[PDB]
Design a protein around this ligand. Sequence first.
Ligand SMILES: *[C@@H]1O[C@H](CO)[C@@H](O[C@@H]2O[C@H](CO)[C@@H](O[C@H]3O[C@H](CO)[C@@H](O[C@@H]4O[C@H](CO)[C@@H](O)[C@H](O)[C@@H]4O)[C@H](O)[C@@H]3O)[C@H](O)[C@H]2NC(C)=O)[C@H](O)[C@H]1NC(C)=O
Ligand SMILES: *[C@@H]1O[C@H](CO)[C@@H](O[C@@H]2O[C@H](CO)[C@@H](O[C@@H]3O[C@H](CO)[C@@H](O)[C@H](O)[C@@H]3O)[C@H](O)[C@H]2NC(C)=O)[C@H](O)[C@H]1NC(C)=O
Ligand SMILES: *[C@@H]1O[C@H](CO)[C@@H](O)[C@H](O)[C@H]1NC(C)=O
Ligand SMILES: CC(=O)Nc1ccc(O)cc1
Ligand SMILES: [Fe+3]
Ligand SMILES: [Zn+2]
Ligand SMILES: [Zn+2]
Length: 341
Amino acid sequence: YTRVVWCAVGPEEQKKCQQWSQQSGQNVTCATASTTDDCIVLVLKGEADALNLDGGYIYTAGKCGLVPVLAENRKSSKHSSLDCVLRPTEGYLAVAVVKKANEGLTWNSLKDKKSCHTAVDRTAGWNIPMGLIVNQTGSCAFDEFFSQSCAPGADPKSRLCALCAGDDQGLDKCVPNSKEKYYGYTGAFRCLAEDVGDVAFVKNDTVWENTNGESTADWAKNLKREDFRLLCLDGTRKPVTEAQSCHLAVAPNHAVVSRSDRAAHVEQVLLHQQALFGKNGKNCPDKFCLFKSETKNLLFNDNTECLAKLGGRPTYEEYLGTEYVTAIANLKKCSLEACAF
Ligand SMILES: *[C@@H]1O[C@H](CO)[C@@H](O[C@@H]2O[C@H](CO)[C@@H](O[C@H]3O[C@H](CO)[C@@H](O[C@@H]4O[C@H](CO)[C@@H](O)[C@H](O)[C@@H]4O)[C@H](O)[C@@H]3O)[C@H](O)[C@H]2NC(C)=O)[C@H](O)[C@H]1NC(C)=O
Ligand SMILES: *[C@@H]1O[C@H](CO)[C@@H](O[C@@H]2O[C@H](CO)[C@@H](O[C@@H]3O[C@H](CO)[C@@H](O)[C@H](O)[C@@H]3O)[C@H](O)[C@H]2NC(C)=O)[C@H](O)[C@H]1NC(C)=O
Ligand SMILES: *[C@@H]1O[C@H](CO)[C@@H](O)[C@H](O)[C@H]1NC(C)=O
Ligand SMILES: CC(=O)Nc1ccc(O)cc1
Ligand SMILES: [Fe+3]
Ligand SMILES: [Zn+2]
Ligand SMILES: [Zn+2]
């Protein structure tokens, strides 16, 4: 009851959950699956209680009757006086990033280039940019737009998985979990930085956290913000400082989801868990920090200040917004009330 089973996606999230489990006195416990979808099925079955999902997955989960419980809240400084847990969520910016040196690459010349995506079905990495691209070409053949990609979760023998590298020994190529080298926000940005792809579809924060010494990871130590450009929809290129005027969309924050009938209890445990291991928590940075994992974004994004309560006890459609929800429905016509599982 006052015991929550968290669902970890892959081995590194499993290991981070184990630590949290150990530290919480097993007030929190762990289940592991190989993909986010499998984790969603565990929650549906009642074998896991919760996990923190990107908005594209919140849409999947929502059709299956899962609900948003609490949202990631970022360190942005309006609503000055208001406590993090009560502060409204601001959303993040979906951007398309390229190298400066790749001159004359703009939004209007992306066809046949090489792309890096966080994973199939994700907001900044997939739903937004592909939604736009299908919209613009009036075609559903989005698997033939780019010449090669790393899009975790696509068919390992498609050109959408050609740029993916798998793990330390080349296994698990293109799995939508952190064993894939180029998975997630930092994986997709690394794919661009290493010059495997021509463009990466990530969020604004990813560029900042992995350049100018902010990272220290070996592939990122020498990366410089000036060496990157954002692609705007008007066909221009701007410095990464112009994200407010050069983005593809504003995305709803990642949120914790649970089965409706478990929402209340998952909420109370987690609010208590962040008091202990959150940003200014009793036991962070002393014993354990929930929101840290050295730019790996394990379980939660590394930039999370706190998990915030959601205004208007919203449904999943209200949490995602009509704008975004219609964008997804239209894109999914290419592959009605439903639930995939
Ligand atoms: C696009 O994304 C980036 C990354 O999230 C946004 O840039 C961030 O803006 C924040 C304000 O909204 C900055 O907040 C504070 O960060 C720290 C807090 O201690 C302050 O000093 C920092 O010290 C740490 C050392 O650990 C460094 O990481 C920082 O470089 C900095 O020196 C800082 O003065 C500030 O009060 C945050 O620094 C900043 N992130 C970075 C890495 O520069 C950006 O706003 C966003 N833009 C849009 C359009 O949304
Ligand atoms: C790709 O193109 C599709 C088809 O045009 C886009 O879908 C459309 O998106 C707009 C923008 O939100 C919707 O407009 C809304 O119309 C409803 C009326 O049903 C109204 O209540 C709102 O005030 C708003 O004007 C529109 O409904 C929707 N069209 C439909 C029904 O399919 C889609 O947004 C495009 N994809 C991307 C990523 O932009
Ligand atoms: C877990 O058990 C109870 C229930 O909330 C609580 O009082 C206790 O502080 C928790 N312990 C930890 C370490 O989370
Ligand atoms: C469209 C949109 O983001 N709506 C929304 C976001 C957060 C929330 O707590 C309630 C509603
Ligand atoms: Fe996301
Ligand atoms: Zn905008
Ligand atoms: Zn409502």
